[PDB]
């Protein structure tokens, strides 16, 4: 028919226009969306955004209106998706990663193996990292029964760019059940700072404020060329018996290294704080991947806008149901 949607749904970012286009593309079931990012400094399409709808319209041949930096307004009718061998050039510091979690889905269910390369940014605060990709949601995917796997090619910092993230997909033989419960005892925790155009000390300010809270079974410093920055980053990796989750921030000028290790520290505190399996935006990348194999749960702490605005539209796409039930503090976020 036609889907409608409201662009200004839980946050009014893109989260909501990303997941509509990676089910339509899978179900061939067109929709409209408006007031997309309408509330934003930098409202409507950003190249992020626009790449995105590209990528997808390219894929699977899609009829649309409005492609256009700063348009508030999409229509999207799929064509036949097809596999292959993609290239996209976001042409700022906007998220590779987003771009590709527009895509992949849809891939999935190609004939055969298919490889997206984007460029543009790499290690953007408010997107996944290719390395949360990679060594936290793919794993997952895997037992799911979906098979990707990520490989950052290069980092382009903001506001320059540059970087570049390839993903390699093989179509879904057979889908698995998932269920994560409670996130289990302490394995390992590893801590990482990568740097680029920024003075070796701050890597290592970083690291001993980390250490000084937490046991390390790992700390790592990766200095990169100068031309990939001015750009720092310090994570922490937290490997559980049941579970592994990754929390990052993104070090900026005018605020120190001591300091941006310590919200990174907080951040984390508040996920160990809680039995909750998977963090807040693990979840909310969880839900297609479920949905589209008919089955799975996880537990999360707080189910953010994003968690809630990808359950509704994948409800409005697809026949299944999600349950979200709390148990003392904890969410269970369950396919009915
Ligand atoms: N620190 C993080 N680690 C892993 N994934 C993240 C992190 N921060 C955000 N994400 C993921 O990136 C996506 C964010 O989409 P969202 O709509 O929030 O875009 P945004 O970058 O905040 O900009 P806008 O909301 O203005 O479009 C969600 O899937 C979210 O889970
Ligand atoms: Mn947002």
Known sequence: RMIALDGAQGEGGGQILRSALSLSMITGQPFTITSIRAGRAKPGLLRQHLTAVKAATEICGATVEGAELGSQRLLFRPGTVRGG?????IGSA??????????????????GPSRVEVSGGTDNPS??????????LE???????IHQQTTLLRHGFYPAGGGVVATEVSPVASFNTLQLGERGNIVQMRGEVLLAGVPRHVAEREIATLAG????????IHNLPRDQGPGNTVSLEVESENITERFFVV???????????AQLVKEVKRYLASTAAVGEYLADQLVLPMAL?????????????????????????????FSLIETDGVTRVSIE
């Open 293 to 321: 194999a008919g089955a799975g749960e996880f537990t999360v702490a707080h189910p953010s806008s994003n968690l809630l605005t990808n359950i509704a539209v994948v409800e409005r796409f697809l026949p299944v149901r």
């Open 139 to 145: 794993p997952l995917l895997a037992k799911i029964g």
């Open 127 to 136: 997107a996944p990292p290719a390395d949360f990709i990679r060594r936290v």
């Open 213 to 220: 809270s937490f046991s390390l079974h790992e700390q790592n």
């Open 94 to 111: 906007g998220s590779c990663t987003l771009v590709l979690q527009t895509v992949l889905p849809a891939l999935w269910f190609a004939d």
């Open 85 to 89: 061998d993609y290239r996209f050039a």
């Open 251 to 261: 070090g900026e000028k005018r605020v120190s290294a001591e300091v941006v290790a």
